[PDB]
Structures are given as structure tokens and as C-alpha cells.
DNA sequence: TCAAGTAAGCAGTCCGCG
DNA sequence: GCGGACTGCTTAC
């Protein structure tokens with residue numbers, strides 16, 4: 022097989038590499054790497070190396086990496102550019118793997134671990150590590166085994182061995198319900214003292230040294246705890262055995278509120294699953310506890326136990342170990358669904374970077390572009406420092422707040438990358454400038470054509486047409502992957518809807534789920550077979566279709582994020598190819614494109630409807646338009662339509678056959694106007710929205726920019742079995758809104774759009790009547806706890822103190838003197854509840870760490886003093902009043918003359 | 925040599941207000 | 943009490 026790297030590190034003048042050889046064996050080597058950098062040379066000099074602007078360079082080959090670094094500094098002191106890749110391990114990777122890397126994941130050791138530490142005196146701080154590690158479960162992907170290290174004797178209690186027999190039993194039978202499918206994969210190892218546990222763990226680690234190291238909060242808790250615990254018991258050099266090269270660094274991570282200390286283990290690639298989840302999931306969760314996320318992702322139940330975790334080992338050691346094991350499995354289950362590890366490996370090897378560098382779009386693109394240029398013997402420019410400058414972005418149209426009955430939306434495919442490709446925007450394709458007219462003159466086609474010769478953006482930039490830039494070239498390759506995967510996602514989605522429609526009428530028999538590839542639209546033959554299947558088989562097929570869809574979503578959305586990341590990186594001062602001329606060439610072109618096509622669509626629709634000057638486009642954000650289809654429907658009638666699906670079919674066909682060619686004609690004209698390299702403005706129909714035929718539903722509404730709701734029947738060719746609410750920006754979509762309130766507001770919206778005013782009013786009255794019975798957690802707001810200390814003046818709120826911070830301070834005063842109460846961690850999320858006046862907490866609100874029950878000490882007081890009236894008014898009524906005023910209706914009737922006896 | 929972007933809405937505090 | 947000038951948090955893109 023072809024060779025691939027596992028990890029790479031630079032240590033002094035040495036590159037340390039772990040890799041898979043031609044026989045598929047893991048190896049390690051230390052290389053005294055001889056890097057090259059480049060300097061501009063005279064035209065007289067015969068060379069094969071040119072910078073990106075075609076200027077000749079001379080290669081400087083150095084005896085070691087230290088000498089290369091010194092030369093860089095000398096060059097800066099002289100005042101001359103030092104060209105080439107200054108991150109030497111990327112150069113090493115590029116030289117060592119001078120081909121497209123095909124990796125074999127089964128050869129890569131992926132480890133997933135979780136540790137338990139009993140602490141009777143608060144959170145066990147990793148920097149101190151003053152408490153015994155009393156459990157470690159470590160799953161190894163190569164062995165496919167969960168290795169469990171269990172401490173039986175400690176200063177906080179001596180316990181008996183954990184029972185696998187009891188572990189497998191159902192909870193309702195006194196067991197722990199450790200999933201049956203991993204019971205046979207457990208290797209259990211009890212220890213009578215911590216020293217031998219930790220020593221065995223280190224020996225084990227040497228035999229099975231992780232390449233990718235993952236888990237939940239491993240980077241911030243487990244890794245530094247283990248390192249420091251070992252350091253404190255055995256000494257520093259023993260703790261350095263966690264690194265295959267015996268080198269570690271206490272690294273300081275900094276943000277706008279403070280800093281934290283992690284441990285870099287050289288020769289390991291740490292991908293903390295919490296960080297993978299935050300980057301790749303595109304959710305914003307009220308809580309990031311593993312229990313909460315597992316429940317969200319997998320619909321598993323909460324792992325129940327009596328008392329606090331600080332006393333769980335002593336009271337129920339059996340469950341303690343079982344839950345440690347299950348926690349490791351939960352991350353494996355989340356990854357089996359989401360496939361973030363596979364994504365990271367794909368991306369890391371594609372770029373030729375350390376796998377952990379997938380967190381940095383800038384590092385990823387620097388490597389991709391370097392490797393692309395190196396292949397053509399081109400030399401990359403030196404990184405330069407730049408002051409941060411604000412610059413303009415997208416256009417957002419101001420909507421008229423209103424109900425909108427029939428709506429059809431259109432959206433530009435991968436806009437910013439498509440602009441890069443159409444215009445041919447790259448550092449080395451810049452051709453010059455032209456004199457800019459006001460943007461509205463380009464939008465209206467009244468400004469003179471910028472150039473007959475070059476490809477243009479309305480920001481004043483011109484680009485060469487007759488050759489590709491490295492940025493267009495490399496962005497295209499990733500875009501084409503994104504397109505492939507999105508196609509798989511949408512087919513899986515379409516397939517799901519077919520299955521959902523068959524679930525309406527089973528059809529009782531004993532059969533099997535059909536073996537199909539869900540990534541491609543089912544054939545007629547498969548569709549026929551599906552109609553004959555049982556509910557059990559269909560539900561299994563639906564599960565598989567949805568998992569295929571999530572896999573396609575993971576693969577497409579994050580490749581989209583990566584290419585959009587390249588467009589944004591052009592506006593980040595740390596990017597080697599930073600250039601506001603290129604960043605603004607993109608954003609300005611986008612503003613023009615949106616507003617240009619708004620005009621063209623309004624023009625076209627007026628024309629076909631036999632009218633003049635009517636406004637069809639009601640809204641647009643960056644690269645979308647929302648078109649009022651009321652006149653299109655009215656042109657026909659109502660009541661020419663048999664059912665809802667009839668008018669949906671009509672609008673679908675109208676969009677594809679009529680509007681789409683006009684949109685394309687429109688964008689082709691704009692492409693000729695800007696004299697661009699390639700026409701790539703492709704605006705697909707997205708949503709078809711409206712009320713059920715014959716209902717009193719309002720279809721949709723807008724309250725303002727980035728705030729709207731639509732009752733959608735078809736989305737990008739997915740025809741829903743049941744209408745789906747598309748809600749953007751409203752409180753239902755915000756993680757700060759209480760769970761039960763998100764639910765109630767969504768139902769209010771559903772009733773508005775599908776059923777009408779009376780149905781809304783009916784629901785509002787019931788919810789108001791029953792609000793006070795909802796579980797306190799379901800009605801608590803959520804916020805991030807940033808800059809707590811800043812506002813803490815002797816335990817009390819300082820000036821400007823945010824509401825949620827005041828809550829934290831109230832909590833801190835309430836728990837002072839209790840070592841068992843969970844501390845609010847700076848930057849994490851909290852639940853927030855308002856308190857009635859005269860409460861014993863002495864303030865108007867309280868806040869506690871989210872995803873948790875509030876500590877039992879003050880629980881009863883919080884419940885007693887909660888202000889339901891303020892809760893209702895702030896989280897539910899205020900937003901609902903915004904929706905209903907926009908939509909021109911009332912959530913309450915509503916005094917009128919009709920005061921007689923209407924029974 | 926660590927290091928995608930801008931636009932924009934709502935909720936809160938502070939403070940003015942015979 | 944409201945509305946305006948800020949911050950803080952958050953979402954759409």
C-alpha cells in the first residue's frame with residue numbers, strides 16, 4: 022500500500038514523524054530536515070523557481086531548521102522578502118508525500134477515553150490534580166475494546182469489584198443497562214492502589230499509543246488531569262511518557278475574557294469531541310454536558326443516579342464504573358452518526374496538515390495553496406503584518422413586515438466561491454483597476470462597462486481572464502466535493518419522504534428492510550417494493566435513510582464552510598494571501614448580483630402577469646430572493662386548484678420552466694457586463710410556501726431583516742409528506758429561549774401559518790392557563806457566563822452588570838460555604854430564572870450551570886420564588902406580540918361591539 | 925511563527941425626564 | 943414609564 026503520515030512534529034532541528042509504511046505497519050522516525058526558503062534574484066539568474074507574480078527566485082538550502090529561522094530574521098532586518106513555507110513541518114509533509122494521500126483509517130489508532138476522580142471538596146482542578154483518579158475507560162479503535170481501569174481502594178472509600186453481569190442487566194432489574202453490543206468488548210482491570218493503576222495505564226499507553234485522541238472535554242480536563250496526577254506521583258519525566266517523543270508543553274489558550282492551560286502532547290493529535298461538535302455540528306446548544314448532547318443526538322435517556330457524583334463511587338460503585346464505560350461509548354455513538362472523525366481525517370490528509378489543524382481554515386488553506394503552487398515550482402510569498410480594517414459585506418433588503426400568503430424563494434449556489442471562480446479572484450490574477458460608479462448604477466445597468474478586456478468586480482478591481490488563479494483552482498476542487506455530497510444528502514432526504522408516505526399505510530407482515538443505497542433516488546421497482554413493506558421494516562429503512570442524510574450533511578456543510586472560509590480568510594490579517602481588494606471584490610459583487618437579479622425578477626414577473634411596477638421580490642439576504650407568488654396564483658385561481666399539492670406542482674413547474682430561464686438570462690447579461698471569466702451565478706428554486714388550500718392559515722410572515730417564518734411544502738425538490746415550518750431568526754431558533762417556550766411559540770407559529778387566527782387564540786389561552794405547571798428547567802432562559810469577575814464587586818453586581826451575570830452572583834452568594842455546590846465556570850452556559858420581590862436570595866434573578874438540576878440546597882427556594890409572570894411576559898408574550906403585530910392579527914380577542922350573550 | 929468574514933435583531937443597563 | 947445610546951449575546955448569511 023501507499024504510505025501516509027499519522028503525526029508530524031518539529032523539535033529543534035528534528036522532524037519527528039509517526040507514519041504507516043508500505044506494509045501497513047506503524048513506524049516512527051526522527052529526520053534532520055533540510056528546509057529551503059527563497060529570495061528574489063536578478064533576471065540574469067537562471068532558475069526554475071518563480072514567485073506567484075512570475076518574479077525569479079533563488080533557492081536557499083539550509084543545513085538545519087534553526088539556520089533557516091535565523092535567515093528569516095536577518096532578511097527582515099535587511100528589509101527584503103523571505104519567501105517559501107516557514108512552517109517547516111508542512112514543507113516536510115509536502116516533500117515526503119509528493120502525491121495525493123490515500124489513507125486507510127483501519128490502520129490509524131483512534132482512542133476515546135474518560136476518567137473519574139472523586140472529589141469531596143469541589144471541582145477537581147487538573148493543574149493541581151490533588152485527588153486520585155479512580156476510574157479510566159479507554160476505547161481503542163484498532164482493538165475495538167473498552168479497557169477499564171478500576172480503583173478499588175482509595176482515601177475516599179474501599180469498594181468491591183465491578184460486576185459485568187449486573188452491568189448488562191436492565192435498570193428496572195437493578196442493573197446498569199450497559200448496551201449489550203459492547204459487553205463482549207469490555208476488558209476489566211481492578212487495582213488495589215492508584216500507583217499500580219497509573220503505571221499499568223502508562224505501559225498500556227506505550228503499547229497502544231493513540232494517534233487521534235478524543236473524548237469529551239479530554240483537552241481541558243482528562244489529559245491535563247492525568248498528566249499532572251502522574252507528574253505529582255511519579256515525577257515529570259514519567260508523565261512525559263504520554264508523549265511518544267517524550268516531549269510536552271503546557272500551552273496557554275487565550276480569548277477575550279481570560280486564559281486556560283492545556284497540555285500539548287507531541288506526537289499525538291488531540292481532537293476533543295466537544296470541539297469537533299462545536300465546529301462541525303452547526304448547532305448552538307443550551308448545554309454541552311455529554312448527557313445533554315447524547316440525549317439530543319441519539320435520543321437515549323438520562324443516566325439516572327441518586328445523590329451527587331462526588332458520592333456516587335462510595336454509594337454505588339457498580340453504577341459509577343458502568344457510567345464511565347457508557348460515557349466512552351456515547352462519544353463513539355455520536356461519531357457513528359455525525360462522522361466528524363472521518364471528516365477531520367479526510368480534510369487533514371487532503372490539505373497535508375497535522376490532523377488537529379482542521380480547526381484552522383487559515384492553516385488548512387495555507388497548506389492546500391502551498392502544495393498546489395509547489396507542484397508548479399512556484400514560491401509562496403512571505404507572511405506580512407497588516408492592521409485590522411473593517412470592510413463591507415453583504416446586502417440585506419428591508420422587508421415590509423406583514424403576512425405573506427404564497428412565497429417562492431431562490432438562492433445562489435455557493436455564492437462567494439462561485440464569485441471567486443466567475444471573476445477569477447486570486448492574489449496573482451490581479452490585472453488593474455477601473456474607475457468605480459455608484460453601485461446602484463451597476464445594479465441598474467447604467468454605468469459604463471468596466472472593461473472590454475478584463476474580468477471585473479464593481480469594487481473597481483480587474484482580473485486576468487486567460488489563466489486560472491490558484492485560489493479559483495483550489496476552491497473549485499473542494500466545491501466539487503461539496504456538490505457531490507449535497508447530492509447524496511438530498512437524495513437521502515427525498516428517499517426519507519417516500520418512506521414516510523409508505524408509513525401512512527402498512528401493511529402487516531414479517532419481512533426485511535430492503536438493501537438499498539440511500540444516496541441515490543429509489544427506482545420505481547424499489548418504490549413498489551416499499552409499498553408492500555411492514556412498519557418495522559419501513560421504520561428501519563427510515564432510520565437508515567436519515568443516517569445517510571446526516572452523513573451527507575456533515576460532508577457537504579463543512580466543505581461549504583471550508584470554501585466560504587477561504588473567501589473570509591482574504592479578510593483576515595493573518596492569512597498569507599490577505600487582501601481587502603480581493604475580499605471586497607467578492608462582497609461587492611455579491612451585493613450587485615442580489616440587487617441586479619431582484620430587478621430582473623420584478624421585471625419578468627410584471628411582464629408575464631401583464632402588469633407594470635408591482636413588487637414581487639419581498640425580501641433577500643446576501644444571495645437569496647423571496648418572491649410573493651400571490652399574483653401568480655391569482656392570475657390562475659383559486660379555485661382552479663384541486664388540492665394543496667396541485668398549486669405546489671404548479672409553482673414548481675412555473676419556477677423551473679419560466680422563472681429559472683429568465684433568472685439565467687439575467688445573470689448571463691450581468692456576466693457580460695462585468696466581462697467575467699465564467700458564468701457561475703446559478704440560482705436554484707428553494708422553498709415553496711403557503712397555507713393548506715381551503716384553510717385560514719396565513720402561509721408566512723416577516724417581522725424584519727433575518728426574522729421570518731414560512732409553511733413549506735417543497736424545499737429544493739424535496740416534496741414533504743407533511744408541511745415543514747421554516748423559521749429563521751425568531752425566538753424559536755435561539756438557544757437562549759426556554760425549551761418549553763420554543764415549543765409553544767413554534768405551535769403558535771404553526772397555527773398562524775396553517776390554521777389561522779382563531780386557532781392561535783385557542784392555543785394561547787391554554788398555554789397561558791397551564792404555563793405555571795411546566796418543569797422549571799423547561800422554562801428557564803439560557804445565557805453564556807462571560808466576564809463574571811468584571812462585574813463582581815464584593816459578591817454583588819457592579820455597574821452595567823448584565824441580567825444573567827447578576828443571576829450568577831445571586832447563586833454564588835447563595836452557595837457560599839458549601840464545597841459541594843457546582844461552581845459557575847467562566848464562559849460556560851447558565852440557566853436563568855427571575856425571582857419575585859422579597860425573596861431570600863436578595864435579588865431579582867438567579868442563574869446556575871446549564872444542563873443541570875439546581876443544587877438541592879436552594880432548589881426548593883428557587884421553585885418557590887420563581888416569577889412566572891415575568892417569565893411569561895419576557896420569553897413568550899413579548900416575542901409572540903412581535904410575530905402577531907407583523908402578521909396583522911391578535912393572539913387575544915380583542916374587545917368589540919359584539920357584547921351580547923354569545924353563550 | 926498560533927490566527928475565515930460582515931449584517932443585524934433583541935434584551936438588558938443607564939440615564940434623562942418639571 | 944419610554945426612548946435613546948450603549949453593551950452583550952446571538953443568529954442569518
Ligand SMILES: O=c1ccn([C@H]2C[C@H](O)[C@@H](COP(=O)(O)NP(=O)(O)OP(=O)(O)O)O2)c(=O)[nH]1
Pocket residue numbers: 432433434435436437438581585588589643644929955
Ligand atoms: O458561515 C457563512 C455563511 C455564509 N457566508 C456568506 C458566503 C456564502 O457564499 C454567502 C451565501 O450564504 P448561503 O447560506 O446562501 N450559503 P452558500 O451560497 O455559500 O451555499 P448554498 O446556498 O449553495 O448551500 O454568505 C459566509 O461568509 N459564512
Ligand SMILES: [Mn+2]
Pocket residue numbers: 173181
Ligand atoms: Mn478485594
Ligand SMILES: [Mn+2]
Pocket residue numbers: 135136137344345348
Ligand atoms: Mn465520566
Ligand SMILES: [Mn+2]
Pocket residue numbers: 432433434435436644
Ligand atoms: Mn447560497
Ligand SMILES: [Mn+2]
Pocket residue numbers: 432433434705737
Ligand atoms: Mn441551493
Ligand SMILES: [Mn+2]
Pocket residue numbers: 432433642643644645
Ligand atoms: Mn443564501
